[PDB]
Amino acid sequence: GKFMKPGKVVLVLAGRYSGRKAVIVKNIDDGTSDRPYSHALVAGIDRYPRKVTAAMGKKKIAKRSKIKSFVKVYNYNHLMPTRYSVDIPLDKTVVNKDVFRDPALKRKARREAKVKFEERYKTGKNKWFFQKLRF
């Protein structure tokens, strides 16, 4: 059946964010008469957290555990679905589709997506999502 669902981890194949890992926030897979193709609202990370080792220090570890995120609406043909899924509770009211008209809202969506990614990056869960794809 259909697998492009919210919470599914995808790989961006085209654009500025090529090769980045991202999670589907909303899937349309039908068109909206302004994007007739099948598209999905996507929240990814721009800058991966750096590798942190034991002999590094708390302040340096905190500085290196910083995530830059992005929110984008991607055509399905530019997304590579994966079998993995992250159940990060992104706020739909902040990260939705109207956010691309007002830049201030878009900063707010990227802010909200950033902090949720950072708290999930802590506790060592979903390690594959937060590692840069090597290609």
Added chain:
Amino acid sequence: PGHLQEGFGCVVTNRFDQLFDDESDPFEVLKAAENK
């Protein structure tokens, strides 16, 4: 071959079959494996 050969008259094979119904993180499934 695989879990789908039941419903197909022809022979069906998939290299990624073992990854079916595995949405968990590979690093944590590894950690569980070397735990056990």
Added chain:
Amino acid sequence: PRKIEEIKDFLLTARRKDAKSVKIKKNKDNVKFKVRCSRYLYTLVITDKEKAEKLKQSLPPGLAVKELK
């Protein structure tokens, strides 16, 4: 050479330190104000005459206002 489209940007290019001189050229259909800076000569073209008279009156002092006629 560089072409300046509107008025106010021409003024601060005129009161730059490296602005050596201003040359005013009157043609049959426009008036060109040419300020000689260090790198480029900046030309501002005004089709209407009273604006040119306004600009010449308000040129910064201490700077050559050589007029070509």
Added chain:
Amino acid sequence: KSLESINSRLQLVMKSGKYVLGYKQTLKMIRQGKAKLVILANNCPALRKSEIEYYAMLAKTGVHHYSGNNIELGTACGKYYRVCTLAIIDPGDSDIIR
């Protein structure tokens, strides 16, 4: 017998069932969840073979590796052009089983 059975079945899929020919359409049909059997010629690029198999694993669809190539898979479909990947929407012939 199986080599001529699939070709005979593939014929009865045509003119009696719904299919789609080509890589771009095949991927579109798989991610819409209404592809049942996806057939790949051994002529297929290896990266394209793996991508479709991964897509089929996500969509729970069977992949049959055709024993020809995009030329004689096109002839099996009754077409005069090469087809490297195709998907079956409904059989009409029972190459798949309910």
Added chain:
Amino acid sequence: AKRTKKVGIVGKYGTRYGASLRKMVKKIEISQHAKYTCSFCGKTKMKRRAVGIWHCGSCMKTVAGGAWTYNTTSAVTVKSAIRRLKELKDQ
């Protein structure tokens, strides 16, 4: 219309070099300038670039082949024999 009765492609050589030599080089030049079907993409774009070098214009896959034909009869049996020796080696 049929422009030549039998010379065909070696008509560029005129009356020169002898009939047998023109006849002998005729089949070689036909194979040498023919476009073979690519076994990788399925298109009839497999053409010779230099001696022994065959290149496809579509998938841009270059292969090492024969001087005049895409593959020599010797090499085909070589590959079959090497394959057979391989499954003899293993079990």
Added chain:
Amino acid sequence: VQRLTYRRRLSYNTASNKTRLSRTPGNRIVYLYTKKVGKAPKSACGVCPGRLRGVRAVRPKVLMRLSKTKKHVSRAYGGSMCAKCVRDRIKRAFLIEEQKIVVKVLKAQAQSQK
């Protein structure tokens, strides 16, 4: 017709002596010595014939005085690799690494027997 002469002491039609015709404000035709035609970068993949897009085609030493944006594209490997082969490598990296997990799990479930 007014006939032309070279303006430099190189009198041979060499690759560095190419000229074009120019009409001066003095109403005379003169030779202007042109620059060689630059080429866009070829893709680092080496498999596709077309040259890269979004990058100015200039002589190599001209690139020193161009800004960064005019010499690359805002994407991974931009200005070095074409988009198509970047997409292929993203997919290939993911699928091969996934297949490494398959063989790892496959031996893990096959080692249950002593």
Added chain:
Amino acid sequence: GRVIRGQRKGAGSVFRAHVKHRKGAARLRAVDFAERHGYIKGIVKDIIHDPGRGAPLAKVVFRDPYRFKKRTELFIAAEGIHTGQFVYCGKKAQLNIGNVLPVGTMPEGTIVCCLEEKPGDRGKLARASGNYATVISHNPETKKTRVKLPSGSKKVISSANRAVVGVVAGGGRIDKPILKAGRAYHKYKAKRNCWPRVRGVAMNPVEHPFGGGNHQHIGKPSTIRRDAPAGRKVGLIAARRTGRLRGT
């Protein structure tokens, strides 16, 4: 009384190889730890034409096992290999066209491409287009392998000698008649200064042992002994027989 042609060839000056546009020495990779104990994977990046050589050259890129670098090799292309193919070199490499592996770990009938004359150098045997060497017999003791060279001779070599599996590309190049003197001119212009060959009988006695006479005749047996001095041994050198080869 004059130094003859052929004698002048050893001085080199004009009779040197035209190597300006040649792409490099076609060699196997140097034997190392990976190739001695396991296998190393390389990728065929390009197949190119080497001037003066009728055999395609394969550009193969390997990973350096000791430092972060890419090593580029210039293998002699076995027929059937294509760009983007993975080739495997080492003791543990399997039997496939293009793979490099020692002759001692091969079946009794395999036929190889770029054979090593000594255990350690690069390929030296069966390098010309369409040529190959056959592995005849091993013996587990004294680490020896017996091979059949393109000339038909049998040679005993160490089992550690490496070789490419298959036949070098370039096929039956000699089958096509050259037809035109100009085509032979272009062929040998990329090789060396040797092509326009003047017959010795057409020369004067001062520049050739066969020169002179009111008719163009040799005047002496053309077969010449092995120990004849340079400037004299021309014609059929140390010939075991002459004529027509009727029987074999």
Added chain:
RNA sequence: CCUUGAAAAUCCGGGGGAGAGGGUGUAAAUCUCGCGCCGGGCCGUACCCAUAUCCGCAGCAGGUCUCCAAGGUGAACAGC
């Protein structure tokens, strides 16, 4: 094309991420953006380039590498 038709200076893009930067300031590291300031030394450079400036003993019917190329006729850088 059994011919496959340089090399190296030099310049650039990318991959990776050792590091550096500041504690919310009218801020830092940094900048391939705009403008502004200073400098670019040495040698050659005239003229002939040919039925008279070169070689051929000479102002020698010889020889000596190139660029530009109008109108008519005409197939035409032919001849007139």
Added chain:
RNA sequence: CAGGGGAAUCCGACUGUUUAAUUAAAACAAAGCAUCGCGAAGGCCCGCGGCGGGUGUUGACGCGAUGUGAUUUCUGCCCA
């Protein structure tokens, strides 16, 4: 501006090259054909000398040494 034509004989197949300054040819070359040497501690060759150097960035579909001279058709007997 701007081909005299035809019927034959000899030689060289053709295109090419040649005795600058008396010989442009039937001479040389040529593709094709044949023979010979050589698996590298090698064949052929240079070198006063060096385990020197060329072929050779080469490996028998290759280098080296000869003869004959396209194609066609043949190439008999003699190893004293």
